[PDB]
From a paper:
Long-term immune evasion by the African trypanosome is achieved through repetitive cycles of surface protein replacement with antigenically distinct versions of the dense Variant Surface Glycoprotein (VSG) coat. The mature VSG proteins are attached to the cell surface by a GPI-anchor, and consist of two main regions: (1) a large, N-terminal domain (NTD) of roughly 300–400 amino acids that is most distal to the membrane and (2) a smaller, membrane-proximal C-terminal domain (CTD) spanning 80–120 amino acids beneath the NTD that harbors the GPI-anchor. Therefore, at the heart of antigenic variation in the African trypanosome are the NTDs of the VSGs. These large subdomains are elongated folds centered on a three-helix bundle scaffold.
The structures of VSG21 and [name] were also determined, both harboring closely related folds and biochemical properties that distinguish them from other VSGs. Of note is the fact that both structures were obtained with proteolytic removal of the bottom lobe (contained in the C-terminal region of the NTD sequence). This cleavage occurred spontaneously during crystallization experiments performed with full-length VSG21 and the NTD of [name] that had been produced by limited proteolysis with Endoproteinase Lys-C (LysC). Presumably these cleavage events in the crystallization experiments occurred from residual contaminating endogenous protease(s) from [name] (and/or possibly residual LysC for [name]). In contrast, for VSG21 and [name], the cleavage in the crystallization drops produced a truncated NTD missing the bottom lobe sequence but maintaining the 3-helix bundle and top lobe of the protein. Finally, it should be noted that for [name], crystals were only obtained with PNGase treated material, removing the N-linked glycan. VSG21 and [name] are more similar to each other than these other VSGs, however, distinguished from them by the tightly twisted nature of the top lobe and, directly beneath it, the presence of a second three-stranded beta-sheet perpendicular to the axis of the 3-helix bundle. VSG21 and [name] align well to each other in the top lobe but not to the other VSGs with beta-sheet top lobes. Superpositions with predicted models from AlphaFold (which were accurate enough to solve the experimental structures by molecular replacement) show possible conformations of the full NTD for each protein.
Author numbering:
A (entry chain A): 33 to 171, 192 to 252, 254 to 256, 260 to 298
B (entry chain B): 33 to 173, 192 to 253, 261 to 298
């Protein structure tokens, strides 16, 4: 559970989805094997003779009962399995978006003369910056959320009105000073990464406290309650035996 | 399609997922019917005599064979059904965030005297503002997708995402208008991100790569698997007794 970034949590959800689909396919394969065994055992028993023909028909009837019971259990487990699978992939996509959103920032503005800062093309604009991944994004459970960064409380601090005694100075390198002769903007990250934990199996998937972040805790909780249905359906699917 | 907001595309994809699960459950139920029919038909044919027995077992064997076929089809579609289902519910789960992040905005800063605007507690801070849904998000209390573009600041005075000058202190940009005066300083903020429409084609054409989040390559790779979802849905719709 080395979940340090939201992409790691999305890949962990991908691994859980892989194990769930593998369990479903194993149950379907056991049902197919029981049905094939029932058909072939019947067809072989038809050409046998005597008490061995009787024993072969008993085995064929047991195989057909096993096939019917397995298909019944799989059809019973299908709905909650699909529900939790859908909610799990929703959490995975939401973690993809929150991971690619963490690299957003407010670009720093170069200092300009104070007379040419509240008007004209030289206005000290606040410029958003989005940073999409270079190609393919994202390429005791832990999840993540987007929090608003708190702005700084002094001169040389993030998301503040930078001041300089000379114009054309970059906040990213030169430090800010208590001056109104030239005005600029010291930016910073627009969103910070908030951790969330949801420790899990009596017989239930924790409860993440609701916050003021995106996603809010109510949404993550509503998705976790369906993921619990998925894991219960997986425990039901594995319990079939052939 | 009637998709106008990013939150609506999630409900469209959810309806598509419900139709896919409906097709899956119908195929599994048809296999269940064939299996129970073969089982009970064999048990009845054992209780008969004469050609009426042979007439029944033949039919029972048919109910066996088709049953063995049905699972063989269903499992054969199960891989491709999942890879497209997951990505579908990925896209929906992404669209819930985009919509919920569309309300993000940079707050306005009340004007303050220039002498106390570049230092101390009285600095003009650029304060981020998130607006999460009061309860569950998106839950009250050719495709049409959406993505998050960057906002563009204005070019003059009294424009969005600019330094607001004013001749008097304690003025709020939401009510006061900015003026070319350096005596008092504040911030005229606005939305941090804008909506950006996205589209595909039913026959899935790779959407042009973006400068936005979600990236064009990511939504493209997910739309590639949604086609496998529809293929497995058709294969599940072509199995019957």
């Amino acid at each position: 559970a080395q979940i340090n970034t939201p992409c790691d949590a999305s890949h962990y959800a991908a691994a859980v989805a892989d194990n769930a689909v593998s369990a479903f396919e194993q149950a379907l394969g056991r049902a197919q094997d029981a049905t094939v065994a029932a058909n072939k055992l019947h067809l072989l028993a038809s050409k046998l003779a005597g008490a061995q023909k009787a024993a072969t028909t008993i085995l064929a009837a047991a195989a057909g009962a096993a096939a019917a019971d397995a298909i019944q259990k799989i059809a019973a487990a299908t709905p909650n399995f699909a529900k939790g699978f859908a909610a799990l992939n929703e959490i995975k996509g939401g973690q993809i978006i929150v991971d690619e959103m963490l690299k957003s920032k407010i670009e720093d503005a170069a200092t300009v003369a104070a007379a040419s800062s509240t008007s004209g093309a030289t206005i000290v604009k606040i410029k958003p910056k989005l940073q999409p991944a270079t190609k393919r994004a994202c390429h005791t459970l832990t999840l993540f959320s987007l929090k608003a960064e708190t702005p700084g409380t002094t001169t040389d601090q993030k998301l503040t009105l930078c001041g300089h005694g000379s114009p054309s100075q970059d906040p990213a390198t030169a430090s800010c000073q208590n001056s109104q002769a030239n005005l600029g903007i010291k930016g910073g990250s627009f969103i910070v990464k908030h951790q969330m934990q949801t420790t899990r199996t009596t017989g239930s998937y924790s409860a993440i406290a609701s916050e003021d972040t995106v996603p809010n805790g109510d949404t993550i909780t509503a998705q976790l309650t369906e993921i619990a249905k998925l894991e219960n359906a997986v425990q039901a699917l594995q319990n079939v035996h052939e």
